[PDB]
Design a protein around this ligand. Structure first.
Ligand SMILES: O=C(NC1CC1)c1cnn2cccnc12
Ligand SMILES: O=C(NC1CC1)c1cnn2cccnc12
Lengths: 192, 192
């Protein structure tokens, strides 16, 4: 057997497993299946370690998985919070900076502060605010522990999750026809 | 979309990834590619967590992966050593207890003691001997620190690895035609 051709076959299969796990991670995030999300994340993380050279499409795929992982840990190496880490990934992914992108970006920025206030760590909320950043007014709300200010109700966790879920639906539609899931669905429908 | 049919497709794909990773784990073990073995082991471990109901064939596959994992850690939750743990898996796998099975079993039993002596932990070598187990003579060799006794040279680490590698070749031939690797090799050969 040719060691090089066998390794190339393993690289193609890793690429297929990556797309399958991204599609599965997107569905568990959309459905709110936390444990399924956690397991798929662990599998995608292990599969990703098996690849050493990635295409532009594959880099986009791993960064989406990393982004959703930090978003999922939002209320739960580096000295920043998971939502601040999601913000750094979001601003660097090779993607269009459209209306939805700006909406998701601004919701994460405000929710990174609000989740600290929700947990009762207001010194952390000010530290998060200082790393990310109107500014005087946002700093006053944190100082007065106004967690339920109308500003926070308009830029809520639920609104952040709904906007991110609309983005996940475009990724899900784009990867719904990948090799591994398409082959699996055919087997399932044949039985039946 | 039907959540049940989507979950069934994910179960079929997990079954395909399991066979692919077992075949890849077998090749890295045969070739002595330690880092590739470690990465594939981590991927198989994560993929296995995603399955909750396994067929008899799939249980045989995960136990082979567990067995090779303990063999690979032989010289490196539970209060026993990795080779003693490999011995427990080996004796419980649904497989024929043929000449090769007994050979591998007896080589692991003796190497579980010899690797402790090689590392200079002779109290551990006696503790391993007591958990597994002629017996008076084997206990004398450990007591006299005769790590290079002709008995240990006939039942060596290299002989243990060669016999296990012959078994791995039968597993490798049996799983060489699984769906994921067969589809990947076709893509590679088409390019070339
Ligand atoms: O970014 C992460 N994973 C990427 C593939 C989705 C990631 C970060 N922490 N973590 C812990 C366990 C598993 N995966 C992770
Ligand atoms: O038995 C194990 N894995 C099975 C799939 C091969 C196993 C034992 N320790 N460990 C650590 C990291 C990854 N996998 C493991």
């Amino acid at each position: 057997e040719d060691a090089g051709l066998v390794a190339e076959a393993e690289a193609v299969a890793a690429g297929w497993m990556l797309d399958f796990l991204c599609l599965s991670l997107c569905r568990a995030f959309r459905d709110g299946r936390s444990e399924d999300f956690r397991r798929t994340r662990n599998s995608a993380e292990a599969i990703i370690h098996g690849l050493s050279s990635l295409t532009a499409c594959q880099l986009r795929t791993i960064y989406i998985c990393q982004f959703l992982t930090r978003i999922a840990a939002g209320k739960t190496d580096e000295r920043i919070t998971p939502l601040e880490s999601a913000l750094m990934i979001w601003g660097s992914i090779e993607k269009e900076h459209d209306k939805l992108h700006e909406e998701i970006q601004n919701l994460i920025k405000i929710q990174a502060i609000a989740v600290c206030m929700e947990n009762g760590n207001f010194k952390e909320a000010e530290e998060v605010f200082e790393r990310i950043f109107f500014k005087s007014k946002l700093l006053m709300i944190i100082s007065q522990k106004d967690t339920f200010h109308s500003f926070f109700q308009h830029f809520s966790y639920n609104h952040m999750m709904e906007k991110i879920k609309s983005y996940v639906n475009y990724v899900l539609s784009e990867k719904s026809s990948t090799f591994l899931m398409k082959a699996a669905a055919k087997v399932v429908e044949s039985k039946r």
